[PDB]
Amino acid sequence: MNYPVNPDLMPALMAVFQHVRTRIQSELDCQRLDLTPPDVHVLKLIDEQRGLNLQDLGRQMITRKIRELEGRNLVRRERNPSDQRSFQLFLTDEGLAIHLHAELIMSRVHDELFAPLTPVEQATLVHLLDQCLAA
Amino acid sequence: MNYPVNPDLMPALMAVFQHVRTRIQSELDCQRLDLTPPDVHVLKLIDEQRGLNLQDLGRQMCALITRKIRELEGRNLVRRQLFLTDEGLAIHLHAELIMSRVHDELFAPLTPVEQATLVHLLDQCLAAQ
């Protein structure tokens, strides 16, 4: 360590992380979407990796959860062309629409979080957050 | 007052979160604690609310928690009303040390003024909500 850390920094950061989760969840709930962070994560992986195998989803995170998502018409399982006993994962039209809607919710929550800052302030914040990682 | 939003901010914040999440898990594994953050959350609630019942704990965590509680019990970290054992108390304390250290290491590259500036900007964001 060079100097003791400011004792308010970890809590101030945690509060922002808390705000983002709380707001996203509240919006999802207000909007009647019945989605949890695990749901959002699963939809994102399936969209990002079309035809994802179940074990590969397992690695990046389940059979019960896919069953739920399939029943809600968000995910479709197709047989693996080489292995008829296993299934690969795809978003339905509805599941894709919901994934992209969830993404727009997340970006709006961030926009609303940051918009009270002036452009100079926002740029300073980017720099400081980046400084934490760059080093 | 609402300004246009810098498109680097959400990714910058997300990157910090993901870095910290990864580092905490790496340090828990480095110390062979065999815990994940949800496990520590259970231990922390049991520590803070010593004697609370299983149903109550389950609700606060928000079958599957009973599985985790049973796993923590099988490791003699939790005893039965729920209490941390001596081993559970020690491992919870060690996890907290790790959480604190990872955050110290996160903010280390910032000078005291940078640290104070970051506190202020994070506060300003929140206060306007």
Place this chain on the structure above:
Amino acid sequence: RDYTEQLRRAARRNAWDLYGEHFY
């Protein structure tokens, strides 16, 4: 016990939960 004071305290308390489950 002001707004951001309370949020900081609550968030610090929930740190394991927040890193354990998030949309990030």
